[PDB]
């Protein structure tokens, strides 16, 4: 049947069977569809048919989720927060089904379905309440060894009516996903500045506070000698090392809590249903960036001197506290001491809140004008809270809570929080009716959404505690004043007091850089109307078609935001010829479009006034032909696709040709600049092995073809296809007992290497000029792994699960990991450095205990 081919459906049961707990487990055996790493342990949506992030739509119960938002980066040579960039991960313990669509799909999922779409539907009371029972309670509890991840879930559901209710609570705590034990084991060295007596014969001083009787004249008889820094070699474990040449991923501390409540009422007649929905899930991704050297070295002290010169008080110290003494320039005018190590932290907080009401009209028998209808209202909010923190007030460490204080001279702290959020107030009408011998299945869908996008920038300040110090001319005694030179007989006259703590607010208003903490607020309304129809043309063929209109209007107080009206037209059509040798000849066509994102609308800024520019939507077109052999053996499916993207949005310049020569006009802006097409192949099948158990097969191979840039644009980096998941084979062999008590499964996955052509390119200039550029510094090698899983149930009640993943301890590095280093990656890693840290996990175990009651 036409609706839907090119789909990939997974149920709640399929999920529990494959023991998927992480977002990465979900498409683990589906080649051609991958999860894009966010950089700090989160994720930023999916990657299909060459495109990723905001080019594949992510929906839950008809409501789109958060857009990936990346704020323009800060100048100044310091570490900052930036926006999260992530897209919110769904709690799988709340979903009944998942519908993944490859290729364009805007008629179904609207804006954002350029290259594909991922749609989730939430569970109901019936998914927990058994066949002949009035209530029910389920209980999944799982441990995943690869990230020391415990997950616990309980689901309550009961019905006395009439009235029904569903209540689900899920708690998850995990850590960093560990790597192969050999990749990143061992030891490494680094330097650390330590105090040493200055050898100069002019390095003498006394301090006023240490002159308890008399004065300089009497106290100079006991001078102290200055101190200087020499660094010393130190060796630590790879886990403890801080610096550029890092062997292990940043330590992650992950937590998730999710609440789902869904009350409902069945009326009389049994064809009327009102129901509410209440979801609140929150995740935290807290890391420490170990790429940052904790300890100061002589190399950086000398560097600062070259620029800033020596510092008053250097080498001099209160009491015997030699260490010291040793302090140098930080950032934001701070002086930082060698006795503390610095630490950098990111505390990300992802919160989704959903409140919705629905009315559902079913009708079988089918005597009224609609066999199915649904009115729904949904208020959703998603917030990504990214809190940067830098401390230099501990011996490492590293402390995230320590602060500069008078008793801690030469300490430092910086805070920076960027909060991104979206809201929908979506009103959806869905009607459905079947007409007739040739049966027509008509479908209409209405939509109204009042939406808003908001980025806040706050808690952005520094603090330091610079020491109270002065070097003074001693009192005259007697005759005339003598300014000392630091000799043993003429030591300096110095006073040293405790540090004075200073705060600086970093935020500015209306200056159009990263430090502009004027909230970026974009609001709007939107409408969609969609008519679809699929007909069964006898037994020989089925034909489907769909049409959709989308309107979107946006406003911002900020006149520089690319704001306006869009009206796009989406349509699809498919055919399934069945000459029935139990083989189907399939051919489908669908359009896809993506409106300018909220980050693209805000535009590129360089601390000067910007005009707003018009942005047309990205568009795509997907032709796909396929053949499937079905029968007693099961089925074997193959398809060839051709997706053509157009009006791709990139940062560049408008171009025009005045007197023969082309030239750039306007500002650097986000414009529709490029088109690109991709072709490929998919094989999918399952064998029955009869034969007189089962097997699975899957294969994907994407290729890039034409890449044409618009003649009215320049400074256009072509297109690095680093998003494309490398060609992969995944075969399966497993046995399910017909009784349904136990089962075994074996999975073999083999991925090709990353094609170097997919990450190479050039930047177009004028007139025939260009510059060759690469996406990453490295590409990945081929690899194969085997997973073995099994289960056992004790009749409806207890059911145990166990999986050994990467049985052969194969040491390899995944491409999806290396992608994080690419230019253009959300929260790109730099500068690597050593690629050991991107190693995939070796042999790992997961265990799940499911209870029904």
């Amino acid at each position: 049947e036409v609706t839907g081919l090119g789909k990939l459906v997974k149920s709640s049961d399929t999920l529990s069977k494959e023991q998927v707990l992480n977002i990465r487990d979900l498409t683990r055996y589906d080649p051609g569809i991958a999860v894009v790493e966010q950089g700090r342990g989160a994720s930023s949506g999916y990657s299909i048919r060459g495109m990723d992030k905001n080019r594949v739509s992510l929906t839950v119960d008809g409501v789109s989720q958060i857009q990936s938002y990346t704020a323009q980066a800060a100048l100044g040579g310091t570490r900052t927060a930036g926006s999260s960039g992530a897209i919110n991960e769904i709690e799988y313990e709340n979903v009944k089904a998942v519908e993944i669509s490859k290729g364009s799909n805007s008629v179904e999922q609207g804006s954002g379905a350029l290259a594909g779409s991922v749609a989730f539907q939430t569970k109901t009371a019936d998914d927990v309440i058994g066949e002949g029972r009035q209530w029910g309670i389920q209980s999944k509890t799982a441990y995943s060894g690869k990230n020391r991840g415990l997950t616990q879930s309980i689901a309550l559901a009961g019905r006395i009516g009439g009235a029904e209710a569903l209540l689900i609570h899920t708690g998850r705590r995990a850590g960093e996903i560990r790597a192969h034990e050999d990749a990143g084991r061992g030891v490494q060295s680094f330097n650390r500045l330590v105090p040493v007596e200055d050898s100069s014969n002019y390095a003498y001083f006394i301090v006023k506070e240490e002159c308890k009787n008399g004065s300089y004249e009497t106290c100079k008889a006991n001078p102290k000698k200055d101190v200087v820094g020499k660094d010393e070699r130190q060796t630590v474990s790879t886990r403890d090392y801080t610096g550029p040449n890092r062997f292990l991923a940043d330590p992650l501390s992950y937590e998730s809590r999710s609440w789902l409540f869904r009350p409902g009422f069945r009326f009389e007649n049994k064809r009327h249903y009102i129901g509410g929905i209440l979801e609140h899930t929150q995740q935290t991704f807290d890391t420490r960036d170990m790429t940052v050297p904790a300890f100061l070295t002589k190399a950086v002290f000398d560097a600062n001197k070259k620029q800033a010169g020596s510092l008053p008080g250097n080498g001099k110290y209160a009491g015997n506290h030699k260490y010291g003494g040793l302090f140098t320039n930080g950032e934001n005018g701070a002086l930082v001491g060698a006795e503390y190590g610095t630490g950098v932290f990111y505390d990300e907080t992802h919160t989704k809140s959903r409140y919705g009401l629905e009315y559902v009209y079913t009708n079988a028998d089918k005597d009224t004008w609609a066999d199915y209808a649904r009115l729904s209202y949904d208020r959703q909010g998603v917030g990504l809270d990214n809190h940067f923190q830098q401390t230099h007030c501990s011996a490492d460490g590293s402390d995230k809570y320590c602060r500069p204080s008078a008793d801690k001279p030469f300490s430092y702290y910086k805070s920076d929080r960027v909060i991104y959020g979206e809201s929908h107030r979506l009103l959806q009408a869905a009607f459905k009716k079947s007409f007739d011998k040739i049966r027509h299945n008509l479908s209409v869908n209405l939509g109204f959404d009042r939406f808003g996008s908001n980025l806040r920038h706050q808690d952005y300040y520094y603090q330091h505690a610079n020491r109270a110090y002065s070097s003074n001319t001693p009192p005259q005694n007697n005759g005339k004043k003598i300014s000392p030179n630091g000799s043993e007989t003429s030591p300096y006259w110095v006073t040293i007091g405790r540090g004075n703590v200073v705060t600086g607010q970093i935020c500015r208003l209306g200056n159009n850089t990263y430090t502009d903490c004027t909230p970026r607020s974009i609001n709007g309304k939107s409408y969609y109307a969609a008519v679809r129809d699929n007909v069964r043309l006898g037994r020989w063929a089925d034909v489907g078609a769909g049409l959709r209109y989308d309107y979107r209007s946006t406003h911002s107080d900020d006149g520089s935001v690319s704001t306006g009206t869009h009206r796009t037209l989406s349509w699809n059509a498919g055919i399934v010829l069945k000459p029935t040798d139990w083989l189907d000849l399939t051919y489908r066509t669908s359009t896809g479009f993506r409106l300018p994102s909220f980050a693209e609308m805000y535009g590129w800024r360089a601390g000067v006034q910007s005009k707003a520019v018009k942005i047309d939507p990205e568009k795509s077109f997907n032709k796909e032909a396929g053949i499937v052999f079905k029968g007693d053996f099961g089925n074997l499916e193959a398809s060839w696709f051709n997706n053509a993207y157009r009006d791709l949005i990139v940062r560049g310049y408008e171009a025009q040709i005045k007197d023969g020569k082309e030239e750039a006009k306007g500002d650097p802006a986000y414009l529709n600049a490029q088109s690109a097409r991709i072709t490929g192949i998919n094989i999918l099948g399952k064998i029955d092995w009869n034969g007189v158990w089962y097997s699975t097969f899957a294969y994907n191979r994407v290729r890039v073809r034409d890449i044409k840039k618009r003649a009215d644009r320049t400074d256009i980096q072509s297109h690095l296809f680093d998003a494309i998941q490398p060609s992969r084979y995944v075969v399966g062999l497993g046995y399910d007992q017909p009784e349904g008590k136990w089962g075994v499964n074996g999975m073999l996955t083999y991925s090709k290497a990353k094609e170097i052509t997919e990450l190479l390119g050039s930047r177009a200039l004028l007139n025939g000029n260009s510059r060759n550029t690469k996406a990453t510094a490295r590409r990945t090698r081929p690899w194969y792994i085997v997973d073995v899983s099994g289960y056992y149930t004790v009749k409806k009640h207890f059911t145990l699960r166990a999986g050994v993943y990467n049985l052969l301890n194969y040491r390899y590095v995944t491409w999806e990991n290396v992608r994080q280093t690419a230019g253009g990656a959300v929260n790109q890693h730099k500068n690597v450095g050593v690629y050991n840290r991107y190693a995939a996990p070796g042999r790992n175990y997961t265990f799940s205990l499911e209870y029904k009651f």
């Binding site: 323009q72 980066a73 100048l75 100044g76 040579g77 310091t78 200055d198 050898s199 100069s200 002019y202 390095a203 200055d226 200087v228 000398d302 001197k305 070259k306 620029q307 800033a308 010169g309 020596s310 008053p312 008080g313 250097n314 950032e331 934001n332 005018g333 952005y460 520094y462 070097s471 004043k481 300014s483 030179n485 630091g486 000799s487 300096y492 970093i506 500015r508 850089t513 990263y514 430090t515 590129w604 800024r605 360089a606 601390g607 000067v608 310049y653 750039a664 006009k665 306007g666 650097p668 320049t714 400074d715 200039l765 004028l766 000029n769 510059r771 550029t773 690469k774 230019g823 730099k830």
Partner: protein, 676 residues
């Protein structure tokens, strides 16, 4: 060596004699001779000097521009100064006078009513109309009809009242005499004072010559080109254009120039010149302003490095060029044209070329031999911007340029909003070398980076010029090393670098530069005038070379202006003066655009925010420090310190000046001739 003049009218042909009559005074052999040559028009004179049958003609600014033009390239050499010597009216100022608080700026002249001194006149017509030429409504030919439809009624005397009625709306008929109440400088001003017009185009002096009272003139203002107003007594900082009154001009490269001055100066002397008897050169028995203007008080020599366009000025040249060539963009998009950067070497030009390519046209490139040649190219408009050290910001500022952006080296979140103060120029001595102070510095051996450089020369000799009023620093110190000085001077008596590189401002001279100057201190000299980072830069091992490997910064102290000494880290209370970091400078009419684009460029190719291995980086260079310093964090905008005096600081300004007027820079000399 004979010097032939040239006269237009047959009346001044007789005025040109003597000749050998009342000028035959103290004639050697072949030198101070003056002949007469007759030609019809003023053009014929310059066309004659183009050959050789003429050598010297005095011209008004309009013809000075004509004489500069090809093929007969003529250069100005001598000017008629008026008034005092302390206040020589060599140039006048074209000015726009308005009533106080009248509510409009220079870019809002459209639809207003104008008062001119007369059609075709310099300050009253050519300059303002020339400067407005592009804003005029097409067709811009004929010019009168265009101006008439740009203003809402004007008094343009000496113009045709019938063909161009609107140009006589404020004065019916356009009287070309005193009969017209609104004629000339005073007449145009009256047209404003009465309220007939909203703006009067006259000379700076006009309002002071028609309004004797301060309170009366307090009711008037001036329009500045930057779209602000200023009081009428600030014309020097608020004028349409500066213009040379009467300028004598020779045939550039290929014609007696120093002989012409030797004449005209000697011709002053013997007031046979004109402030004794016979014959007063300036006044004529049969005519007015015959050979020279009667208002003249004598002559001054135009500085060597002064070409015509630099002499007439950017504003004037721009206005007249518009008036003649008439070339204006038919598509006035009112957006920013490419910024033309100026490169000082092949390596700078290479990097600039790469930048221009990566900047998709927003940056273009021009080269020049020296720093001063580039500044002059920015002045005349052949270039737009370049980065300059504090020293060259002072001279560029005396030449009418402004700083747009400062180079910043501090790592901070708000780098691009906060301009850094800069560094400190200090005097370094050894602690062992007792007894040294700033007072008894006379007779000691000094170490300078190079003569003419900011911290190494200008500032220290600037503080010392207020001790001994003479540019003989050679005879103040015992000896020393100041690379660039005369070979027979005492400031080369202990340099190094064999050959002819001895005492030469380049790295072949081992004592050139900050580093070399400090090396001079530790090996030969006893006091170095250097940067406050210099000593730590070359101690502790940062300088791996043998002469500096074991050196310790704490072996050295600093000379303070109060006669005391402090260690090298106490520079903040022991310096000569504060100097600013490098700054990008440009013309005033480019300030906004340069500001806009350079800030855009650093967000495209800035320090971080890009992979410097894979792409272009603005702040990285194939050798060292090309275009900008290599440790530039970002370019910071300038609010308060947007002028050269405010950017440099009062300490720097008070320090030099003196040493100025005593300087060697020929560019500074040239710009000082125009201001003042």
């Amino acid at each position: 060596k004979t010097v032939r003049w040239c006269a237009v009218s047959e009346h001044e042909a007789t005025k040109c004699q003597s000749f050998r009559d009342h000028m035959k005074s103290v004639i050697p052999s072949d030198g101070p001779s003056v002949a007469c040559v007759k030609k019809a028009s003023y053009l014929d004179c310059i066309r004659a000097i183009a050959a050789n049958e003429a050598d010297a003609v005095t011209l008004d600014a309009g013809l000075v521009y004509d004489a500069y033009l090809a093929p007969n390239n003529l250069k100005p050499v001598v000017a008629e100064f008026y008034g005092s010597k302390e206040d020589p009216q060599t140039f006048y100022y074209a000015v726009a006078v308005v009533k106080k608080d009248s509510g409009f700026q220079m870019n809002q002249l459209r639809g207003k009513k104008s008062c001119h001194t007369g059609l075709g006149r310099s300050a009253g017509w050519n300059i303002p109309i020339g400067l407005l030429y592009c804003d005029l409504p097409e067709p811009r030919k004929p010019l009168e009809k265009a101006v008439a439809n740009f203003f809402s009624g004007s008094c343009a005397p000496c113009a045709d009242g019938t063909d161009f009625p609107q140009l006589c709306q404020l004065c019916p008929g356009c009287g070309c005499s005193t009969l017209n109440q609104y004629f000339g400088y005073s007449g145009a001003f009256k047209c404003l004072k009465d309220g007939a017009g909203d703006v009067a185009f006259v000379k700076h002096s006009t309002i002071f010559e028609n309004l004797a009272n301060k309170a009366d003139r307090d009711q008037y203002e001036l329009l500045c080109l930057d779209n602000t107003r200023k009081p009428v007594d600030e014309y020097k900082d608020c004028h349409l254009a500066q213009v040379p009154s009467h300028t004598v001009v020779a045939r550039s490269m290929g014609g007696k120039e120093d002989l012409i001055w030797e004449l005209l100066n000697q011709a002053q002397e013997h007031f046979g010149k004109d402030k004794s008897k016979e014959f007063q050169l300036f006044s004529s028995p049969h005519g007015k302003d015959l050979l020279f203007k009667d208002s003249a008080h004598g002559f001054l020599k135009v500085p060597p490095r002064m070409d015509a366009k630099m002499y007439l000025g950017y504003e004037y040249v721009t206005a007249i060029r518009n008036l003649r060539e008439g070339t204006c963009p038919e598509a006035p998009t009112d957006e920013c044209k490419p910024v033309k950067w100026c490169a000082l070497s092949h390596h700078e030009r290479l990097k600039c070329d790469e930048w221009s390519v990566n900047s998709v046209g927003k940056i273009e490139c021009v080269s020049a031999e020296t720093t001063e040649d580039c500044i002059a190219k920015i002045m005349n408009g052949e270039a737009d911007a370049m980065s300059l050290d504090g020293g060259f910001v002072y001279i560029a500022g005396k030449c009418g340029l402004v700083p747009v952006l400062a180079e910043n080296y501090n790592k901070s979140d708000n780098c691009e909003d906060t301009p850094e103060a800069g560094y400190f120029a200090v005097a370094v001595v050894k602690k062992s070398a007792s007894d040294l102070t700033w007072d008894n510095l006379k007779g000691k051996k000094s170490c300078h980076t190079a003569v003419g450089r900011t911290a190494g020369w200008n500032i220290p000799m600037g503080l010392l010029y207020n001790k001994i009023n003479h540019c003989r620093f050679d005879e103040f110190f015992s000896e020393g090393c100041a690379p660039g000085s005369k070979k027979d001077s005492s400031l080369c008596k202990l340099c190094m670098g064999s050959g002819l590189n001895l005492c030469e401002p380049n790295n072949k001279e081992g004592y050139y530069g900050y580093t070399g100057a400090f090396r001079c201190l530790v090996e030969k000299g006893d006091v170095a005038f250097v940067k406050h980072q210099t000593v730590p830069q070359n101690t502790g091992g940062k300088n791996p070379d043998p002469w500096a490997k074991n050196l310790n910064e704490k072996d050295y102290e600093l000379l303070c202006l109060d006669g005391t000494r402090k260690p090298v880290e106490e520079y903040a209370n022991c310096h000569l003066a504060r100097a600013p970091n490098h700054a990008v400078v440009t013309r005033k009419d480019k300030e906004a655009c340069v500001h806009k684009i350079l800030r855009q460029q650093q967000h495209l190719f800035g320090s971080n925010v890009t992979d410097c291995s894979g792409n272009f980086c603005l702040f990285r260079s194939e050798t060292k420090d090309l275009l900008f310093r290599d440790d530039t964090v970002c370019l910071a905008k300038l609010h308060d310190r947007n002028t050269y005096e405010k950017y440099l600081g009062e300490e720097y300004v008070k320090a030099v000046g003196n040493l100025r007027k005593c300087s060697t820079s020929s560019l500074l000399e040239a710009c000082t001739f125009r201001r003042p």
